Each structure stands twice: as structure tokens, then as C-alpha cells.
């Protein structure tokens, strides 16, 4: 590892505290993500190791260092392997690149101590009360960029509809990532059952479960069918607190019926949760059906893959606005990191014209895909089933969003033309560059998923047709 | 591989030119670097395929976006493995990190051109034209900021002795890396001339430099000895010619001190330039200013002391024979190559480049006393131990410390290795740092079983005690 370095706060985390081998390591910003994961293995094992240490800079007469500068380091015996809570609790509460690089270059001037007795675990920074060489170039912890976020994230859920009230910027609460979103919202509903409506994002059942609903009801598809059952037990008197959906469903660009959903809502007393990450609010307008919405900013939101960012939207018109936006308020503490939120409120100053321009050149190869011989079908909300329930959340002028499925002939054809396909390849989607991936690595089986970026649609027809033919004996 | 990422930019190039799979890439900032990578491949092997790519965002309303967003890719098979020379420019030239990270933001709104007639090369950026949603939070190339690093670096170096002319601002030229300083000297010099001396500076991309800026008669000269200083008078009174002479003032790993007052007393007979690099012993201890036309320094290392910033820069001597020359030169062939977000840590981790050398030098010769004392300890490489002591006094400012690195030589290599492994300290081969850090000789490609330490900002208590732990672990 020749200098500069980047990364290494975990590394420089563990010399400082003498457990350089041995152990596993994560860091968090808050001491209750940290808490999750020490019980997550202690449940495995009752008597493993794990230590809770709390970085932070002990004297300044800057609050901007002192809010920010600050970590907690969980140490855990390697025998734990990581399941899928870990790894989304991990993925939604760990701390961002940007903020483990601000850590990792103040750690000299960072003290850690531990609530058990290990003197290992307390110790004083070698620079600990000097003045630091160089202050960050955001102010007032990134509060100016937080709500150009909040501002544009409350113009674009607007409702096409003028009878009601428009959400405001402080109806938006703005968290680490889009899973901390969904996490704290879990919660907030946990002070009866709550209801999994085609989602499978993997990430929101594990957080769900987490939050205190032990076996939440699983509607794994999303059909109407299945809302048959929800209201059958509704009907029969079951009681429910929240129902989690999202539209434009991953990856077979699914749309609930959010219009029967809001019915049973009203009908029988519960709080529908609706993510927008995929959908898009400048595609949708689902603030009539929803009364929280939530959205992964580290997506088409921000286009770049370089920032993270979830947010949290209480819709006025919710019956439950008053209880809900109390308790986001009241257990609100801030853990975006400014200089995240600085590169998101500066990528979604174009956030609707790049959602369009993605969103039509994904319309168009996708029907370029579809009339190809070895493709079966193509899932895009043009093509879909739902295809007229779509219609009725789509605003005018609006197109039919950036992620599409291929769903091949041939399985074998399939990987031959994903290997083939010179494009980025990975798991994250709204992104400004085009990127693929096969249900192998999500975790039919053999579906090809694309996410269109802003690459011209010859370009895109010309990455996609060169593929094609590599794959054709 | 989930959002955020970090680094991609050689994959997003990569995925641009259609050559995802099947191709080796390096990306440089300049065309002659990219030119000296395609000739040692095309030597090593001449029907490998060499292609030079250059991107660039041509238009643009701020200076600033259209000077920076460009560099040129190099590909080349993958059978090609790197050699020692290829490792080093690639080290000098490439791209800094930071420059990297802003270019791969802006890679939509860049096209890419290429030479040959390639037409998979010949792109242009899906955003071409339009403009990007944030500039960057530096001005001007960080010229600001480039003042504050040359105006510090001629600070640190005037000479105790009041008869020497200082050096100015504009006597101090930056660049991207220590190597690509040392390039530029190089190369300078062979314009006037054939035979360069490198005199004991090991490990390092200096003789790889050397030999590539077209020197046809090198000499090295490995330990620095006066033995060695005899041989060249001989040869130089003999009539052998002689162009430059490369030397560092604190040596790697061994801290030995080379003789500059005879160094200097040889160029004056014999006219040709001293190049010295102060990286290791460093200006704030050491004045060398008085036997060197050219000074070069490293700034990514403790100058900068963060691990967090490349720099390289190149003091020209106002009292040298040939400070118009190599003046003149130096700025008549010129480009920015400092990326402007490194200018701007550099400049302000440099304001306390002073007390932090005061400081690791108090560490450093405490921690290596200490070691030296130790009876499983042979002997201790710091210039308060070594034979070559009484030439760094020479050298050493009054009040001002023996520096910050330090090598061990252990008795028994098998407790070398189990010191190492206890050593609860960063490991890796930088020095210069604000945190400690060791490096075996492994890794380091004089005894092969030397351990090298760079003492950083930490107290002596606690450094103390790391190398105590260790050295208990250390025993069957
Ligand atoms: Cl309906």
C-alpha cells in the first residue's frame, strides 16, 4: 500500500486499540446501529467478544469537527459470518466513504473510550486539543445542501393534484442511506403486524423484522390476489399497523395497486410505506396513495454512485402526519454527513431531466429488445402486466422509468450475451452509466436486469446488438 | 460492489474503448510519459499491441474544469508483466489519486482521440457539451495554494549563513511526484554531456529515471563512501566526464550521510551539477542548501505527513554556477502536472511541516536509543549511532534533531520476523507519516532481515510501549 492511502480508518481504528488480528470489525456513527449488530452476535453466541468502542474528538471550539468527527468501532470474533441483517445493517447505518475519510484524517486528534474494562480500548490521541491543519469546505454541517435536498425531494413528490397539500421541506427527513430510511420508519410504526407487499428489495425484511416485528405477513408477489387474502383478513377482523411496498418493483418492474391499497388503508387503519427509489417521484405521483414515502438518494437521485442518502417524506394528508412526523421529529439526530449531502444537493439539481432522459432511451431499448428472436419477453412497465396500472400513477408528459429485465430463450444464451455486454456490471442501479447484472449475483434465474443510464440510445443499441451477436453461435 | 464507488476510473475508460477484458491500462497526465511506457513494452516485445488514448473535456466555460478533465490511457496486453523501471514511471507519472476521483465525475462530459485509426478510441462523453452539475470548491489551479507550498519551501531551506543568496518562490518548481522532480532535472541536464553519477540512493525509481533520460554512461555508486568519492576523482582527473551527480542526504535504509562538502568541492573542479534530495533528512534539519544546484523533495511524504496528498517539488540554487541554465530550462518547459485539490492539502498540512519533522526527530531519536540499548539488538541505522554521524553534524541545523526514520538490525533474523509480526503499528513501505509505521526488506524489493521504522506524531509512551509489547512477544 504505497501513500496516499485511501480507506484505512478500520485498519487505523484497530492499531489504535491494539487489535490489529484476531477480530472482525465494523463502524457505525450511531451507538444504537452498533448495538444491533453486538446482539445480531450474541444471539449466535452468548458468549462471544464484543467489544463497543466510541471514537470521537474530545476539544475544539468547532461544533462542525466535534458533530461530526466522530465513530463507533464494534469488534467481534471472526468465527461470527455474517448473515443477510448484518450485512443490511451494515449497508444501511455503516459509515459513508466521504465520512470514514474525514474520520481517518482527524484521528490523531480522536480519543476512544469503552464502557467495559478495557484499558486497551482507552486511549488519547497523539494530537488530541491541537488545532487541526485544515478545517472542510462545507459549513454549518452541510444544513445549506440538506435542504436544497429537502426542497427538491418535496417539489418533485407534489402532487399533480391540487386538492392536496403540497409536502414541504421540513416534511422530509433525510438519513445515511435509503435503507436507514426504511429502518427508521420501521421503528416509528413499532411505538399490531405489519404487511411485506412485493418487495424484494432484500434489504427491508430483514430491517423490519429487526424493528420488532417478528414475523411480518409476506405478500411476496404483489397481485391483487394476494390483496384478496389482506382484506379477507382484515375483513375477518386481523388487525395491521404498516404495509411496505414499492413501485416499480424490482426486477420485474411490478406495479401494486396503490389506489385498492390506500382503500384498505382508510377502510381498516393501518400506514402504507411506499418507496419511489425505482419509480421515480418525477415519473409517479403516488403522494394521494402513500402516507410515507421513502427514496434511495444514492440512486438516480444523485446519478453519479458517488454519495449516499436516504430520505424520509410525511405526507401532510396522512391521517397519521401528526403522530408520524412527531416521532421522526422528536427522534431525529442528523447522520448524513455533510459532505455527502454537498454532492447530493448539487446532482439533484437535474435529477427530473436525467430520470426523463434515462427513462426514454430505456423505453426505447427495451422495445428494441423485445422484438429480438432470442428474447422471451422483456419486463419494463410498458410491456408488464401491470402495464395499466402504471398508467394511472403516471404523470403527464412523464415516461415509464430506467430500470428494465430481460428475460432470455435460452439460459445459456443469457450469460453469453451478459459476458459479451461491455457495460458496467453490478449490483446498483439509478446511475448514469448503463449497468447489468444476473439474478446469479441478487442473491426465472437465468434474467438479465439493466438499469439505463445516460448514454445515448445508439450508443446503447450499438453495446447491446454487438452483445447479441457474440451470444449467437 | 454497491454505491459509493471509489477509484474506477481506469474500468470506466476501459468500458468507454470496448476493451473491458484482455488488455493491461495505465493512465498518465502526460503524453511523453504515455510514449516512454509504449517504448519498454515495445522492446521487451515488439508485436504487442500499444494503443495511447487521450481524454479530455475540450470546452468548457471554467478554465479550471477544461485544464484538469484530461489524461491519457495506455493499453497494452496483459501478458506484459512490469519490470522495475515501468513500476517507477508509472509511480511518478501517474495519475494522483484526487486527480483520478475528479476526473472519473467527469468522464460523461469527455471525449476521447486517439492517433492511430481506432475507431473503438474515438468517442465521444454522453454528456459532451453540457455542463456539470458542481465545479470544484479549489480556484485558479490552486495557484493560492501552489504559493503557500513554494513560499514555505523556501522558507525551510536558507542556508544558517547570511553571504547566500535565498531562495525565492519562483526558484521552486512543483510537480505531481519526488520521481517526476527527479525527471525533470534528469532530463534537463542531457541537454548541453552523457555521464551521470548516482551515489548511494537505493531503492528507489532515481536509477530507473536516470538510465531512461538517455544517460549512455551511468555510474552507481551504491553505499556512498569516500572509497567510492575516490574512485570519481580518479576518473575525473583521468579525464572521464561527468554531467550530474544524484545523491539523497539521509539514506535509505541505512540513514548514512554522504560527504556534500567533497561532493561539492568535485563539482567546482570538474563542473558538473549536485542534485540532492532532502526528502529524508529534510530542510527543517538539515542545511545542504550551500553544496546542491538542485534540491528535490518529495512532498507527499512528511511535508505533506497526512497520507492523503502527492506532491513533488524542485528547488533551483540562485547561488549555483548553473542556476540560469537549469533556471531558464526548468521554467521554459513547465506544465502544471500538481493537481489542484493535492496543492490544496499540501498547502495547508505544510504550515506545521517544521514542528511536525521537531516533532518525529524527538520520537525518533528517543525510540531508536532505546532500541539500541536493547541486547537483542546488534546495532541501530540513525544518524545519532551510525559511523557517518559526524558528516550529518556537519550538516544538522543547531537545536534542529536527527530525523525521523530509523532502521533496526536485529541479532537473530528469526527474532526480527517475530518482532515484526507483533509490532501493533501500521505497516506498508511510505515514510513521512503522522502515524508510525515498519517495513521488512521482503517488501523492500546492508542485512535482508533489517526492519525499517518512519516514527510519526505518536509519544514516545506510546511508541515506547508498542516496540516493548513486541520485543516480549518477540521471545520463545
Ligand atoms: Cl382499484
Known amino acids: 500500500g504505497f501513500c496516499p492511502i485511501v ?14 488480528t484476531g477480530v472482525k470489525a465494523r463502524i457505525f456513527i450511531s451507538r444504537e446501529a452498533a448495538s444491533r449488530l453486538e446482539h445480531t452476535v450474541k444471539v449466535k453466541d452468548p458468549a462471544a467478544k464484543v467489544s463497543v468502542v466510541q471514537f470521537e474528538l474530545r476539544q475544539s ?36 466513504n466521504r465520512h470514514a475519510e474525514f474520520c481517518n484524517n482527524l484521528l490523531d486528534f480522536m480519543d476512544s473510550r469503552c464502557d467495559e474494562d478495557e484499558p486497551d480500548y482507552q486511549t488519547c490521541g497523539p494530537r488530541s486539543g491541537d488545532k487541526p491543519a485544515g478545517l472542510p469546505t462545507w459549513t454549518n454541517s452541510g444544513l445549506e445542501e440538506k435542504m436544497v435536498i429537502k426542497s427538491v425531494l418535496a417539489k418533485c413528490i407534489r402532487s399533480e393534484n391540487a386538492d392536496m397539500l403540497p409536502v414541504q421541506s421540513d416534511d422530509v427527513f433525510l438519513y445515511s442511506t435509503g435503507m436507514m430510511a426504511i429502518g427508521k420508519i420501521a421503528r416509528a410504526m413499532k411505538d399490531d403486524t405489519a404487511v411485506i407487499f412485493g418487495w424484494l428489495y432484500s434489504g427491508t425484511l430483514p430491517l423490519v423484522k429487526d424493528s420488532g416485528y417478528s414475523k411480518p405477513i409476506l405478500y411476496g408477489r404483489g397481485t391483487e390476489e394476494e390483496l384478496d387474502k389482506l382484506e379477507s383478513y382484515l375483513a375477518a377482523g386481523g388487525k395491521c399497523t404498516v404495509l411496505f411496498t414499492e413501485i416499480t418493483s424490482n426486477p420485474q418492474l411490478h406495479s401494486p395497486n396503490l389506489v385498492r391499497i390506500k382503500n384498505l388503508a382508510d377502510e ?68 448524513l454527513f455533510p459532505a455527502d449531502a454537498v454532492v447530493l444537493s448539487e ?46 400513477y403516471r404523470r403527464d408528459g412523464e415516461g415509464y422509468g430506467y430500470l428494465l429485465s430481460i428475460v432470455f430463450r435460452e439460459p445459456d444464451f443469457a450469460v453469453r450475451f451478459f459476458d459479451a455486454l461491455d457495460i458496467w456490471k453490478g449490483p446498483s442501479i439509478g446511475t448514469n452509466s448503463s449497468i447489468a447484472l444476473p439474478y446469479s449475483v441478487l442473491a ?3 434474467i438479465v436486469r439493466l438499469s439505463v443510464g445516460l448514454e445515448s440510445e445508439a450508443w446503447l443499441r450499438d453495446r447491446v446488438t454487438e452483445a447479441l451477436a457474440k451470444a449467437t453461435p
Not at 268 to 292: K, R, W
Request: aromatic share 12%; proline share 6%; with cysteine.
Open 268 to 335: 381498516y387503519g393501518f400506514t402504507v410505506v411506499v418507496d419511489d427509489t425505482i419509480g421515480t417521484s418525477v415519473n409517479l405521483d403516488i403522494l394521494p396513495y402513500a402516507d410515507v414515502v421513502t427514496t434511495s438518494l444514492t440512486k438516480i437521485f444523485n446519478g453519479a454512485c458517488n454519495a449516499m442518502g436516504g430520505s424520509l417524506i410525511v405526507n401532510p394528508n396522512s391521517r397519521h402526519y401528526r403522530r408520524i412526523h412527531t416521532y421522526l421529529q422528536g427522534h431525529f439526530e442528523d447522520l
Open 444 to 446: 426465472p434465474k437465468h
Open 7 to 20: 480507506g484505512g480508518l478500520t485498519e487505523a481504528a484497530l492499531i489504535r486499540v491494539k487489535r490489529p
Open 347 to 392: 446532482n439533484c439539481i437535474d435529477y427530473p431531466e436525467r430520470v426523463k432522459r434515462c427513462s426514454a432511451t430505456a423505453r426505447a431499448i427495451a422495445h428494441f429488445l423485445a422484438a429480438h428472436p432470442s428474447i422471451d419477453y422483456v419486463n419494463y412497465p410498458t410491456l408488464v402486466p401491470s402495464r395499466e396500472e402504471y398508467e394511472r
Open 61 to 96: 471550539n468547532s461544533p462542525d469537527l466535534s458533530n461530526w468527527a466522530r465513530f463507533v468501532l464494534v469488534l467481534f470474533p471472526e468465527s461470527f459470518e455474517e448473515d443477510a441483517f448484518t450485512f443490511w445493517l451494515n449497508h444501511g447505518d455503516g459509515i459513508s
